Design a protein around this ligand. Structure first.
Ligand SMILES: O=S1(=O)C[C@H](c2ccccc2)CN1
Ligand SMILES: [Zn+2]
Ligand SMILES: [Zn+2]
Ligand SMILES: [Zn+2]
Ligand SMILES: [Zn+2]
Lengths: 286, 130
């Protein structure tokens, strides 16, 4: 039994040398015998590889003292309706040097904002994991024809994540002490969160007593939505998957049952608006 | 397409440490909360008549140790996250690590908590002679 989390998406026909393989599963078949691995002097380590590792498959079901849960109940999300931000990501497919994973392309929020990122992935090397641009293509061109020009209008992730913090801080400072991302089939949104979210124990702002919602790597500091100027990470966010609330069809068909003012414009922010809208209609009517 | 590197038993801890600001603290707190140690490490079939040094070029496990592939014992390699040392490069990936048989249940936690004696090349307490 295996998972898609951290799947190796390179086109290399060989497994890894025992010293370089992150796991027993990834060790090359030549070194395997009796459930274990053997060192073969004469078969050397690879010193040039670049292996794209898949970020699809995270499971945030940890239960650790002092670490708040990212996924909250519907009843807790209802209490924090002022923190609701709809979130959707349109992804691109890994191509050329790698195949088998999706990278964030256009990140959409219920605020109406769409941010385009350069297709970036987590590439294992003989020394470390290099977070860097990877070759990518928009999904098989039909309903994804609007993504083709976006493959060149993207911003580096260090810029993109600064804009997310700036947008959330500007929207939520006078509304909530937190953010609740409202999602539909959360899988790829959670994968995208790996690019701009950090988690840990509950902290307080460096400039005030309000709880910390932001983190800065540059200075190892925490800030609330008021003092997050220049911060790059969203810290300890909350989320909920609206799809799991007993819905039969797709996002648009369920949203359209209660609302006729958000026409589908086939864009990430439009899906994020429809997601938050559907959550509001479902949670507060009858 | 692609080849699976992981097993479901590791999903929770790997996801927890892959999102943490401090992944080493996250792993130690995860274990302290009753969480299972990271499994699917590269355990070596060796003679157990080796030099006994901590980090080696070939498996050097003695009768009191178990040899492992280095990257598989490194939390930062296992999570695909930044390495703490200012150069961002790993000291275990590319080498074999000798873990005491009593701690072989959690190779990742052992390397995270322990240090190699720069004089004799053996783990401090397991069993550095100084
Ligand atoms: O040689 S093998 O036994 C190991 C190889 C593998 C490579 C990369 C990631 C996971 C798995 C698949 N067949
Ligand atoms: Zn503050
Ligand atoms: Zn609507
Ligand atoms: Zn490492
Ligand atoms: Zn010593």
């Amino acid at each position: 039994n295996v998972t898609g989390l951290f799947k190796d998406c390179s086109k290399v026909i060989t497994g890894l040398h025992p010293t370089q393989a992150p796991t027993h599963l990834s060790v090359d078949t030549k070194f395997k015998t009796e459930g274990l691995c053997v060192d073969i002097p004469g078969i050397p380590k690879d010193m040039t590889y670049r292996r794209l590792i898949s970020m699809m498959g995270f499971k945030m079901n940890y239960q650790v003292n002092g670490y708040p849960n990212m996924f909250i109940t519907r009843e807790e999300a209802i209490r924090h309706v002022r923190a609701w931000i709809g979130f959707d990501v349109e992804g691109c497919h890994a191509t050329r040097e790698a195949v088998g994973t999706n990278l964030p392309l256009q990140l959409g929020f219920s605020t109406g904002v769409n941010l385009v990122a350069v297709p970036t992935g987590y590439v294992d090397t003989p020394n470390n994991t290099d977070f860097s641009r990877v070759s990518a293509k928009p999904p098989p061109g039909d309903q994804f024809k609007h993504l083709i020009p976006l493959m060149y209008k993207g911003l580096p992730w260090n810029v993109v994540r600064i804009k997310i913090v700036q947008m959330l801080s500007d929207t939520l400072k006078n509304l909530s002490d937190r953010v609740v991302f409202v999602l539909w089939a959360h899988g790829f949104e959670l994968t995208s969160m790996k690019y701009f979210v950090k988690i840990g124990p509950e902290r307080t702002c460096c400039l005030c007593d309000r709880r910390a919602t932001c983190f800065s790597t540059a200075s190892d500091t925490y800030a609330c939505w008021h003092h997050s100027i220049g911060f790059d990470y969203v810290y300890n966010p909350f989320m909920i998957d609206v799809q799991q609330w007993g819905f039969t069809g797709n996002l648009q068909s369920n949203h359209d049952l209660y609302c006729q003012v958000h026409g589908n414009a086939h864009v990430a922010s439009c899906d994020a608006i429809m997601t938050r809208c559907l959550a509001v209609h479902e949670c507060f009517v009858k | 397409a692609g080849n699976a590197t992981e097993v479901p038993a590791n999903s929770t801890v790997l996801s927890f440490c892959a999102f943490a600001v401090d992944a080493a603290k996250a792993y130690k707190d995860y274990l302290a909360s009753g969480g299972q140690p990271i499994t699917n490490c590269v355990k070596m079939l060796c003679t157990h008549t080796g030099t006994g040094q901590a980090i080696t070029v070939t498996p050097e496990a003695n009768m009191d140790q178990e040899s492992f592939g280095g990257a598989s014992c490194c939390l930062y390699c296992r999570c695909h996250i930044d390495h703490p040392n200012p150069k961002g490069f790993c000291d275990l990936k590319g080498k074999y690590v000798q873990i005491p048989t009593t701690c072989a249940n959690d190779p990742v936690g052992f390397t995270l908590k322990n240090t190699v004696c720069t004089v004799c090349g053996m783990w401090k307490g397991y069993g550095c002679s100084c």
